[PDB]
């Protein structure tokens, strides 16, 4: 899973790689299912999808809390900008 | 880019798409970055390399942050879990 | 998302493709949970990435019985093997 | 095939990898041969790509079970949820 | 699925083509499942893997039997060479 | 190119999986060739992409007997269904 | 199998495509062919290995000439430097 | 991620690969921000990935300027054609 | 080859589309002739390679000035950054 | 990587390999540039594209007279076809 070898990363790097991975799979699954959401024509599928999928968000901002409470710009960088007010671009 | 043809999604739902793909996009960088800085031996090289990857993280949290304003359930697991204390489970 | 054009496709093979792509998806992501559960040597993490593991299970089990009201055959052969005592190739 | 090193994996973890990604490929199977069975418009190939999907799912079916017998998760999301009557989500 | 645009394909092609990517999954099965067959630690999930490794031989030769009675030069090599005794390339 | 390691595996499983993996690349030659042909617009390259893909054809025939020489059940499976008259599902 | 969409692209443009990807498809089974020769641990199998990839140079060649014939500069750089003496780098 | 085994690779050329891919990712970075600012119809998101975009470009020009400073043939090419006025092919 | 639908884009960023994924696949073709190059055992594929090599580097440049005509940060961030003296961050 | 483990390949082997997706890769510039040549908007773009296009078969008949000089068949198979006039299937 990582693009350089093991013998020359430290450990913590590994283990945010592994957070970081788990991130990227959750927010995949979020779009997949709430795309799929839109085109159900099953309605009793489409609550199960809607279901799954806002799971797939708590288990994001877990791994994420971890990664913020593990890497300093994480901590830096959310805490400029998550639960903010006006223009994010200017936070 | 998306799965299901677009002329059955909702617009607001293929401009989280856009998003959650950019979020994907950062945090694959920053990983990359963060070994390559680890296993680089130069070190004016590796200066770039953590600046880039400490950007990446910027730019994952301004468009976090837009998702949270967007999605009412990234606005409710976010607020559980980020700048907490304790066990996160 | 599909392999053939949704123009010949039956409505329910399209909702049954978006179940088992779903199950595939959890399936997966099971796997690589429980190898880094494995791996990662950070306690605090290896409790999220096992507790995420096991919620994964719970949205395939959810997706899977899905399938097998809205397919016969799935239904058939989940009740042939699905809590069975004796050796399951029998 | 595993995304971390087998040394640091346990054994089980990596026979459920094993069973896991033979479901994965099962299911996968599934969707193709139904979608080609629609698509498809000689009706012999038609039986036999419909006569080996209803056999995939035998397949899954099979490795399924033997993922609940030697998970005790999957073994009680799969009980809470596998042949039911209601509403799934609840 | 396919590659070309359909709208030039002629329907006896896409017909072969839904066959042929048939019995090249059924081929990787085969080789996947006979890996994990070797590889395997436990007992009950080596049995399934055989079990349906072997099935997916059966899938793959009914496949072949239909390109073969579709497809006149897939006929004529079939029947040069399989079932034979001596060297193959010969 | 095999999930499992390679001293855990059988050397006729290996030698196995060289020839299937030939097999597929075979058919997949024989599907795209195929479809170039019919889309093609140049009568000379369509000679050749024709004359190419049942060549594809013959290797995958002579690969296939080497199977069924080193194989059991594709011995068993291939000999039930193929040069054979009536429904394939049978 | 085209990046750009066919509406913008020459017929010319569009046939050469075919053949390019084709001399690829040859030229990568000619690679994995001639690799699987030297791990071959069965001979009759090696036999068949390298039967097959020479003659993917044949349709490799064949499949060249024609895009030599159909471009002036394919045709240009190939005379300067197929069948030539001394270093290739001039 | 190298295509060939690190013990054979020298080091600077494992540095200059560090530097390659991760402009590679900056382009490619830039390519899709570009595109989803034409298509967002969400002012506040394209302003962020209006925002990244650029800044993409500068983490792209730091390390490309490093590439220049530790390749020769990179700061003759680099230094040949940007920065200039009139026909670049000349 | 794109990710948004063809008929929302300018066609400006189709250009630059078309010319960042060329000096992406220039420069992934730069890194393996490199790497081929350390590896080759043998001296005549050695200055093919090699050969290539530099020249997918002179492709890069003039597709890389373009993009610097045609996208005003990349003229930016390039002016900033190319030909300088001292550390780059 | 190659495909087979580097222990079993001959040196000759993994040179050619080396030489193989060599053109491989150049084959597929070649493709891609040409249908940018044909989409391009941009004049001074599209002259680009097309220099690089031209140089890029110079790339691959460089490496390919490599190829012709290194491996029999390629060579044999080469002289019958390259610089011919006639029907090439034949
Ligand atoms: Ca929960
Ligand atoms: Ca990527
Ligand atoms: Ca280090
Ligand atoms: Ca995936
Ligand atoms: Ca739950
Ligand atoms: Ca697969
Ligand atoms: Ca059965
Ligand atoms: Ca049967
Ligand atoms: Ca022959
Ligand atoms: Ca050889
Ligand atoms: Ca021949
Ligand atoms: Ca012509
Ligand atoms: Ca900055
Ligand atoms: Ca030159
Ligand atoms: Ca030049
Ligand atoms: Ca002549
Ligand atoms: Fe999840
Ligand atoms: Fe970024
Ligand atoms: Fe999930
Ligand atoms: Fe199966
Ligand atoms: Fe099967
Ligand atoms: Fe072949
Ligand atoms: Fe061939
Ligand atoms: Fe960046
Ligand atoms: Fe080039
Ligand atoms: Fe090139």
């Given at each position: 899973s990582t693009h350089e070898?093991?013998?020359?990363?430290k450990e913590e790097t590994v283990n945010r790689h592994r957070?970081?991975?788990s991130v990227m799979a959750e927010l995949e699954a979020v779009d997949w299912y709430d795309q799929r959401v839109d085109?159900?024509?099953?309605?009793?599928?489409?609550?199960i999808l809607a279901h799954n999928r806002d799971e797939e968000k708590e288990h994001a901002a877990m791994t994420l809390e971890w990664l913020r409470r593990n890497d300093a710009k994480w901590?830096?960088?959310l805490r400029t900008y998550l639960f903010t007010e006006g223009p994010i671009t200017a936070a």
């Open positions: 070898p093991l013998e020359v990363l957070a970081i991975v085109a159900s024509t099953d309605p009793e599928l489409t609550a901590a830096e960088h």
